[PDB]
mmCIF file with all atom_site columns, N, CA and C in Angstrom:
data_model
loop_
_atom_site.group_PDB
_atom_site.id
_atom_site.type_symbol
_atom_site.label_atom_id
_atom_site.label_alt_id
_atom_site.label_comp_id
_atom_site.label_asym_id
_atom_site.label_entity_id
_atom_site.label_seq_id
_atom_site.pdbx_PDB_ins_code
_atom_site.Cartn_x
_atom_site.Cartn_y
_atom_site.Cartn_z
_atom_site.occupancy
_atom_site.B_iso_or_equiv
_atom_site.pdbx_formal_charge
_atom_site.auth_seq_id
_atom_site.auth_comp_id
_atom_site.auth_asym_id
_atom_site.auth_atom_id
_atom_site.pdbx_PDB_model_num
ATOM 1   N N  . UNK A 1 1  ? 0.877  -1.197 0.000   1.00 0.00 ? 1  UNK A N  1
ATOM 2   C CA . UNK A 1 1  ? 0.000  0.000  0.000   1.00 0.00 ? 1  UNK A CA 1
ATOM 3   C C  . UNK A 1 1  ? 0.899  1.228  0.000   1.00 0.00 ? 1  UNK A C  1
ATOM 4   N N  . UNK A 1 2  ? 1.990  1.575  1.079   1.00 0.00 ? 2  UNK A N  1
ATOM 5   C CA . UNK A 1 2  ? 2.299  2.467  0.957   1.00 0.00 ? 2  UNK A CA 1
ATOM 6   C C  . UNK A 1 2  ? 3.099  2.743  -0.346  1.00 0.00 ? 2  UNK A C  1
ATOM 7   N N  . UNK A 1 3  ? 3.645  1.562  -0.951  1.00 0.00 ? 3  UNK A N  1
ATOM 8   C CA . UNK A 1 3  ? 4.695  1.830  -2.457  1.00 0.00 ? 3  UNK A CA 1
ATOM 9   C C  . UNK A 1 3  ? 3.570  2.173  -3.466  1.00 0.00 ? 3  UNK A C  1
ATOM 10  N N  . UNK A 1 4  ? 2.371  2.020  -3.251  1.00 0.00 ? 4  UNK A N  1
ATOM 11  C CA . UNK A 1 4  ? 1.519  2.374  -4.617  1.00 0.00 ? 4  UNK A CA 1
ATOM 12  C C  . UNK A 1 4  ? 0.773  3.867  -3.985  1.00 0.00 ? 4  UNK A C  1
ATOM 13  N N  . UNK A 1 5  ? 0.907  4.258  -3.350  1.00 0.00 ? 5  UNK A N  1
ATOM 14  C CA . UNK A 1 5  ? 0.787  5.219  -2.422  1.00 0.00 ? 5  UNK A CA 1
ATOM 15  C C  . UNK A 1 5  ? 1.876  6.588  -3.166  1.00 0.00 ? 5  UNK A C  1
ATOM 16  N N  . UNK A 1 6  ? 3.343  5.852  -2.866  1.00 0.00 ? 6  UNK A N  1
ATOM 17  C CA . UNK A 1 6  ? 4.000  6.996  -3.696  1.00 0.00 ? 6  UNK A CA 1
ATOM 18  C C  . UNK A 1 6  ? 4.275  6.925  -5.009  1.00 0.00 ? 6  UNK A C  1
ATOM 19  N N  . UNK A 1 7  ? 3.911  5.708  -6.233  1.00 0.00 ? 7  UNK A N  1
ATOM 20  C CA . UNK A 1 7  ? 3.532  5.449  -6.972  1.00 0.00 ? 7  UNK A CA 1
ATOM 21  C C  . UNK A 1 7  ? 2.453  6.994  -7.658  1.00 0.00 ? 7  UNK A C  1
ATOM 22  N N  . UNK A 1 8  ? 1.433  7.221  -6.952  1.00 0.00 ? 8  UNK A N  1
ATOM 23  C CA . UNK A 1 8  ? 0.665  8.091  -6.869  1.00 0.00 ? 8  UNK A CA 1
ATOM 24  C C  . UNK A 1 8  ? 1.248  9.127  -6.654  1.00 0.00 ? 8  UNK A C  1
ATOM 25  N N  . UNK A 1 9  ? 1.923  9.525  -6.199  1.00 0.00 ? 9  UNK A N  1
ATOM 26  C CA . UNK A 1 9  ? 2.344  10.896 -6.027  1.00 0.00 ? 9  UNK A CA 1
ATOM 27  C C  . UNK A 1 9  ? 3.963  11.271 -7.008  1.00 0.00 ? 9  UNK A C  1
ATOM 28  N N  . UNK A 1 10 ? 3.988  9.964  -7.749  1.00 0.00 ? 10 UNK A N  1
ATOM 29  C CA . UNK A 1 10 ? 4.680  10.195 -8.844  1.00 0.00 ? 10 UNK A CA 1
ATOM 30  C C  . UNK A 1 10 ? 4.029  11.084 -10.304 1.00 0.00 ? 10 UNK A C  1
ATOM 31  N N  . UNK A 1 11 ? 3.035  9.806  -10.377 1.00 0.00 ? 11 UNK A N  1
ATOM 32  C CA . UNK A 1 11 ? 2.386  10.921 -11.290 1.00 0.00 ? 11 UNK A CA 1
ATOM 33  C C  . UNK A 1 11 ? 1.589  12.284 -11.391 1.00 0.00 ? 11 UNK A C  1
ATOM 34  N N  . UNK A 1 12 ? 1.356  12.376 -9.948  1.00 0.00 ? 12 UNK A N  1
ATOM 35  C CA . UNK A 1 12 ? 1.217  14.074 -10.034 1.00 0.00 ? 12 UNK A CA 1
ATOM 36  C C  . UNK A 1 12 ? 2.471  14.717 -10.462 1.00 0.00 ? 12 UNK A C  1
ATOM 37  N N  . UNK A 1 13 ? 4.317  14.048 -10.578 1.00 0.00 ? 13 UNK A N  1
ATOM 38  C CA . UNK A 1 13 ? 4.768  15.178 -11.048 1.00 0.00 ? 13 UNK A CA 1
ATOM 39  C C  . UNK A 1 13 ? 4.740  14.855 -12.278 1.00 0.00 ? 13 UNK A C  1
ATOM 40  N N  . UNK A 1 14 ? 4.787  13.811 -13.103 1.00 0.00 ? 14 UNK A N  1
ATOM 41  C CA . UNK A 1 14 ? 4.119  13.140 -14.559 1.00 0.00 ? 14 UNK A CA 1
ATOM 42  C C  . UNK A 1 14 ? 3.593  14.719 -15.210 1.00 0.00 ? 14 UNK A C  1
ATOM 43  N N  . UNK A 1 15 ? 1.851  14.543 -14.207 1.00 0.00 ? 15 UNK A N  1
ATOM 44  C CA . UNK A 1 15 ? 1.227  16.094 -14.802 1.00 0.00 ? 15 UNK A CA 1
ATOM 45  C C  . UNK A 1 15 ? 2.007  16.916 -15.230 1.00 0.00 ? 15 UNK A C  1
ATOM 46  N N  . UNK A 1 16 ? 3.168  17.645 -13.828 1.00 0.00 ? 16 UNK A N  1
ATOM 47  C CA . UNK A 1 16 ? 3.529  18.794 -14.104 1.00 0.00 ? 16 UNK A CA 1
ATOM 48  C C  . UNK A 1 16 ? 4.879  19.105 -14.959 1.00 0.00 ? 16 UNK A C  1
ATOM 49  N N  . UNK A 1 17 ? 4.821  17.866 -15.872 1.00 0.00 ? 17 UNK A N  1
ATOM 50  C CA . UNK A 1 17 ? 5.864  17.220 -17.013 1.00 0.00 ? 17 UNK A CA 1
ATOM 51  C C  . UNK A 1 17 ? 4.957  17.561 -18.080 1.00 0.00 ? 17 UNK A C  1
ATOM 52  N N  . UNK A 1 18 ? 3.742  16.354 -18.388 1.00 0.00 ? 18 UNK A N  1
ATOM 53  C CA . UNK A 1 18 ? 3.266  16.024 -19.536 1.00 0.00 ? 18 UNK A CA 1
ATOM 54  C C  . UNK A 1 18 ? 3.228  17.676 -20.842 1.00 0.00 ? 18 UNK A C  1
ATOM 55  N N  . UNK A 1 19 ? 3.020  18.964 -20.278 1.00 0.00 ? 19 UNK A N  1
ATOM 56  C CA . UNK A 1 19 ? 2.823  19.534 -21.555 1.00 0.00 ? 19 UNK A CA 1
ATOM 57  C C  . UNK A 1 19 ? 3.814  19.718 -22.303 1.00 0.00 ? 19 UNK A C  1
ATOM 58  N N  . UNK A 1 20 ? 4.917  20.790 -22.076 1.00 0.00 ? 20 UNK A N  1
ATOM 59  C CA . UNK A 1 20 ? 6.550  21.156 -22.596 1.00 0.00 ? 20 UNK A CA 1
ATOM 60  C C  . UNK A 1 20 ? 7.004  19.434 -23.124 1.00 0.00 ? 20 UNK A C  1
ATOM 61  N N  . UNK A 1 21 ? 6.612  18.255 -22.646 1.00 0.00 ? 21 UNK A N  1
ATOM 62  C CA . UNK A 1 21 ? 7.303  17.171 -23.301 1.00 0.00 ? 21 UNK A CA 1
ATOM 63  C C  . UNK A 1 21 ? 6.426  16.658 -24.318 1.00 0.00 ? 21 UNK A C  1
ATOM 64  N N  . UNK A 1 22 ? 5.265  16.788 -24.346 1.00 0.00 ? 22 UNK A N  1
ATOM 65  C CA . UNK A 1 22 ? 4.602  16.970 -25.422 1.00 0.00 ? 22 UNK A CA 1
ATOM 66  C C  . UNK A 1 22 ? 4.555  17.774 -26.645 1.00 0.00 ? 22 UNK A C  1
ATOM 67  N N  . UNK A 1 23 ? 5.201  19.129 -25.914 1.00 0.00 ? 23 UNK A N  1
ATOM 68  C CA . UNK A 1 23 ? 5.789  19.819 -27.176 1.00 0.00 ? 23 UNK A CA 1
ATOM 69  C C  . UNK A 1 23 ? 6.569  19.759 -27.754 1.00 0.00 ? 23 UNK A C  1
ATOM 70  N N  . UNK A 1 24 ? 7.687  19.000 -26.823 1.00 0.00 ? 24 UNK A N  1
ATOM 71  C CA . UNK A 1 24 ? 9.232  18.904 -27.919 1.00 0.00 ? 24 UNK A CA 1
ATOM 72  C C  . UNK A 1 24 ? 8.842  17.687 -28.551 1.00 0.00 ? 24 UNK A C  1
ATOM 73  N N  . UNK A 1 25 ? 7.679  16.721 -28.958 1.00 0.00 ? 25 UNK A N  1
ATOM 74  C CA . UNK A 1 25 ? 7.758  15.728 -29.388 1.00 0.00 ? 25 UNK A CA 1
ATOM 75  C C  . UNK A 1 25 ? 6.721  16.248 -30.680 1.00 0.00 ? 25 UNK A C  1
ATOM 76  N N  . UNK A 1 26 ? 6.141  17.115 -30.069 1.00 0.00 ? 26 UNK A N  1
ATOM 77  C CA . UNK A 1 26 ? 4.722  17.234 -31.270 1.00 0.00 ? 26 UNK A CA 1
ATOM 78  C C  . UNK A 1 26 ? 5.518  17.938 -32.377 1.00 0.00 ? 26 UNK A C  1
ATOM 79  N N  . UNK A 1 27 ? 6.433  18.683 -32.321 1.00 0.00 ? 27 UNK A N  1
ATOM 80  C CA . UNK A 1 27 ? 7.236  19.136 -33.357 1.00 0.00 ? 27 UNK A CA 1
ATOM 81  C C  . UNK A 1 27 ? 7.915  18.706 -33.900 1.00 0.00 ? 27 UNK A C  1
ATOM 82  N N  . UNK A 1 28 ? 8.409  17.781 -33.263 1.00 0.00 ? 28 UNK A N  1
ATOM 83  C CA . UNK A 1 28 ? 9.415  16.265 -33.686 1.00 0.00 ? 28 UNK A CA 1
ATOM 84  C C  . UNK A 1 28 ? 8.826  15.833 -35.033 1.00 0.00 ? 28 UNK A C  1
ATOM 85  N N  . UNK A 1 29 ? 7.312  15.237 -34.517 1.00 0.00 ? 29 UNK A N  1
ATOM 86  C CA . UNK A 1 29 ? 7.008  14.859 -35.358 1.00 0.00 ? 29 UNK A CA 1
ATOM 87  C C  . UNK A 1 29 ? 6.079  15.709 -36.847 1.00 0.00 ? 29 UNK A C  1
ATOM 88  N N  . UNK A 1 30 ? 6.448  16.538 -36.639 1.00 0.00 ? 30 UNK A N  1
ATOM 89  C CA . UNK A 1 30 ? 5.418  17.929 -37.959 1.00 0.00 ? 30 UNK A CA 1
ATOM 90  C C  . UNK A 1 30 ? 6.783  18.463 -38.465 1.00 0.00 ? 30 UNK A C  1
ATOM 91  N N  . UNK A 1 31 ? 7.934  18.959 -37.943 1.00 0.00 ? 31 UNK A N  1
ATOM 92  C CA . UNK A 1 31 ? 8.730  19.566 -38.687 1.00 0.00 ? 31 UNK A CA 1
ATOM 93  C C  . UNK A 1 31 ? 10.260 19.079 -38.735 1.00 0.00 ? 31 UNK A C  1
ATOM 94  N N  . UNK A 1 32 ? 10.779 18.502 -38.192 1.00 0.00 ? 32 UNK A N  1
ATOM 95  C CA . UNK A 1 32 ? 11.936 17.559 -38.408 1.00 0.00 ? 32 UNK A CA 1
ATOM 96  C C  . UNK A 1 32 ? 12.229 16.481 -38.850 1.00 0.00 ? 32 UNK A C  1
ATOM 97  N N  . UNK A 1 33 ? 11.477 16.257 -39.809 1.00 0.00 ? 33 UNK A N  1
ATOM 98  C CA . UNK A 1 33 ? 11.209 14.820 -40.369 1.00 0.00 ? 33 UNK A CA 1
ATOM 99  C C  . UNK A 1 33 ? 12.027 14.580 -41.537 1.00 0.00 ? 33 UNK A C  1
ATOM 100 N N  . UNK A 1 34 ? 12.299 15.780 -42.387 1.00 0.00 ? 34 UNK A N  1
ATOM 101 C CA . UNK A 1 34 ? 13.547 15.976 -43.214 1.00 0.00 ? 34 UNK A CA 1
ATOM 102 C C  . UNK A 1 34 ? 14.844 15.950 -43.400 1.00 0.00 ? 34 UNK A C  1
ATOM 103 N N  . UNK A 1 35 ? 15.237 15.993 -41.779 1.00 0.00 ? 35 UNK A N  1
ATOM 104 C CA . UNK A 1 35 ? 16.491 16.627 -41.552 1.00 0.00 ? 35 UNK A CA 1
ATOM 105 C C  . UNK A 1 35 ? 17.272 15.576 -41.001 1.00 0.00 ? 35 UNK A C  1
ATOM 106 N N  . UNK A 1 36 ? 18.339 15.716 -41.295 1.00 0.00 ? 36 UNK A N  1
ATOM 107 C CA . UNK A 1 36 ? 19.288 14.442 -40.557 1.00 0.00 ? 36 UNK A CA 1
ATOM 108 C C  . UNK A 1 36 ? 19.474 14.455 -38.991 1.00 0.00 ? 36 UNK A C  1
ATOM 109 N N  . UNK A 1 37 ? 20.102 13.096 -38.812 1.00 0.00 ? 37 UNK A N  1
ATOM 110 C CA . UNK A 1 37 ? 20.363 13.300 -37.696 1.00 0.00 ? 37 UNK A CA 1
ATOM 111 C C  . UNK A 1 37 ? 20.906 14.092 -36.659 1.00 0.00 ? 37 UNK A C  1
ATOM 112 N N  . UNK A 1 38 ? 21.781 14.490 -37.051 1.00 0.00 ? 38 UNK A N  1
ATOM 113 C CA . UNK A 1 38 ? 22.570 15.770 -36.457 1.00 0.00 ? 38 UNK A CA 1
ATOM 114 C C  . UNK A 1 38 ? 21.948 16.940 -36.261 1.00 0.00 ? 38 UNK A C  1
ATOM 115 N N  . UNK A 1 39 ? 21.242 17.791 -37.381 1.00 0.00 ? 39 UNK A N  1
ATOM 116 C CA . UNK A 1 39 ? 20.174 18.826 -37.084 1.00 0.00 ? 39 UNK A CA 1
ATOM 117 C C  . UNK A 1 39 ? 18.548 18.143 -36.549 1.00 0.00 ? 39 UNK A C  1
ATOM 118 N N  . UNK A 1 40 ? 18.468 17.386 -36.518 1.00 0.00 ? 40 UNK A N  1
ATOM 119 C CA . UNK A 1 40 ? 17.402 16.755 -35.820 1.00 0.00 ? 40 UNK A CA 1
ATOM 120 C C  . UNK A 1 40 ? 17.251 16.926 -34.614 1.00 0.00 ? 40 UNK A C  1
ATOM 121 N N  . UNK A 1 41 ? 18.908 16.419 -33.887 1.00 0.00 ? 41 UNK A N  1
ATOM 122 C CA . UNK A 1 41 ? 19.349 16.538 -32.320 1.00 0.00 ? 41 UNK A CA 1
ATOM 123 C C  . UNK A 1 41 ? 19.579 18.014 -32.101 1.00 0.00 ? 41 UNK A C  1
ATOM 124 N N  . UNK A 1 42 ? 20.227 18.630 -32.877 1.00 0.00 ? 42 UNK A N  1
ATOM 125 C CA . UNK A 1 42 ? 20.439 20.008 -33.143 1.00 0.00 ? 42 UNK A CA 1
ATOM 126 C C  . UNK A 1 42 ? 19.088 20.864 -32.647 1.00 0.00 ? 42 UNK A C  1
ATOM 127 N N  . UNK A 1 43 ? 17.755 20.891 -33.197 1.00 0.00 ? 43 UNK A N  1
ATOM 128 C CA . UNK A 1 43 ? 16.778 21.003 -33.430 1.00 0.00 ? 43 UNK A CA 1
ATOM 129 C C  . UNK A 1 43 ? 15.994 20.893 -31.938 1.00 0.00 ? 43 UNK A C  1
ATOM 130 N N  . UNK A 1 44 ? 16.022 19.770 -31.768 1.00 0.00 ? 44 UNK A N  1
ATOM 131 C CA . UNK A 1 44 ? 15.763 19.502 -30.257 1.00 0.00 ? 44 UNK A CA 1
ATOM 132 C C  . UNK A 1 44 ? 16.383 20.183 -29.572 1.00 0.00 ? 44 UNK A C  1
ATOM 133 N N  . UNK A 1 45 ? 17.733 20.389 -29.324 1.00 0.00 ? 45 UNK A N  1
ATOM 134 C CA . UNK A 1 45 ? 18.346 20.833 -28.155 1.00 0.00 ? 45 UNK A CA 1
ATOM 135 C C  . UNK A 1 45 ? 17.814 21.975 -28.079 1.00 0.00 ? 45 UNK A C  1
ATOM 136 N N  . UNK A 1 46 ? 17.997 22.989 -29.162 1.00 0.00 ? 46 UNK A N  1
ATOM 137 C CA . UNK A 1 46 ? 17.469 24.029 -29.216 1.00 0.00 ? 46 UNK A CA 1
ATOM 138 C C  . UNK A 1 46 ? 16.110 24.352 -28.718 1.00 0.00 ? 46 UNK A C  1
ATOM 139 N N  . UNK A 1 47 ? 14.903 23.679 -28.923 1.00 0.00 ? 47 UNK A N  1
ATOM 140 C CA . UNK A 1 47 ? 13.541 23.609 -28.253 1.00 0.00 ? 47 UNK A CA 1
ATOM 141 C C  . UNK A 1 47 ? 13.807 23.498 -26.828 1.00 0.00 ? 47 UNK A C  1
ATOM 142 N N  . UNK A 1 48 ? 14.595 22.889 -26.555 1.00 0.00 ? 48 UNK A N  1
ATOM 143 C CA . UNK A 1 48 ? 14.940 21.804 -25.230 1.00 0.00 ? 48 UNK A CA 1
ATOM 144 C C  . UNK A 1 48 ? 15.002 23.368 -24.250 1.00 0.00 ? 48 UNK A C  1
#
C-alpha cells in the first residue's frame, strides 16, 4: 500500500511534465522529419 501510495504521487509530477514534453515531441514529429540526424538533435536541443 504504501509503495503504490508513492507510486501516486509520482504521477502528479508526470502532470507537471506532460505539456513542454509533449511539445518537444509534437514538433518532432510535424517539422523535423527531413532533416538528418545531427540537425534533428540540433533542433531539439534548441527547443529543449
Amino acid at each position: 500500500r504504501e509503495r503504490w501510495e508513492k507510486t501516486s504521487e509520482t504521477f502528479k509530477n508526470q502532470m507537471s511534465t506532460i505539456a513542454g514534453d509533449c511539445l518537444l515531441s509534437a514538433a518532432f514529429i510535424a517539422y523535423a522529419g527531413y532533416f538528418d540526424q545531427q540537425m534533428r538533435q540540433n533542433l531539439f536541443t534548441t527547443w529543449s
